[PDB]
Symmetry: C2
Subunit: 94 residues, 2 copies
């Protein structure tokens, strides 16, 4: 598939979450596209900070969402992932 | 290989900074080795969060260091870099 379309559709997902000032937990991209997606969000008008938490949990965080709260959320996500919960059942923001 | 030495030597510096809850702005890694260094820190027992805003300025943030403060610092660093200051003269933590 084209990367432009992948980035465009994931931008639409990000926008839906960012409209509520929620972070977008998304690990679908390979390297270095994972980091580049943050440049895409910012270029397209969606102010975003990229974090990788707990070693391997990436997230795109809108302005207006507390980064320390996202890190706290990642700690809980890690415990729940280890217990076998799928990504869509993990907490988005504590 | 030289990458193994690179990661091992920078681990030592990160450990020293993290002991004082200071972030490590380290620009010696070529993307995507920048993100991989954060994975290495975590794999070696140094709890670290990787943060990227809008320029090349890799940062590795320990537990107990405020990520919102690091984000604000990244913004100030970018503005000062744009004005001509060298990396060594930039703030590490507002
Ligand atoms: Ca904070």
């Amino acid at each position: 598939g084209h990367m432009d379309e992948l980035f465009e559709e994931h931008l639409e997902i990000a926008k839906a979450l960012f409209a509520q000032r929620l972070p977008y937990w998304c690990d679908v991209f390979l390297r270095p596209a994972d980091q580049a997606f943050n440049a895409y969000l910012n270029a397209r008008g969606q102010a975003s900070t990229y974090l990788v938490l707990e070693g391997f949990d990436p997230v795109y965080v809108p302005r207006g969402c507390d980064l320390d709260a996202v890190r706290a959320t990642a700690r809980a996500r890690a415990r729940l992932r280890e217990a076998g919960l799928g990504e869509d059942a993990l907490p988005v923001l504590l």
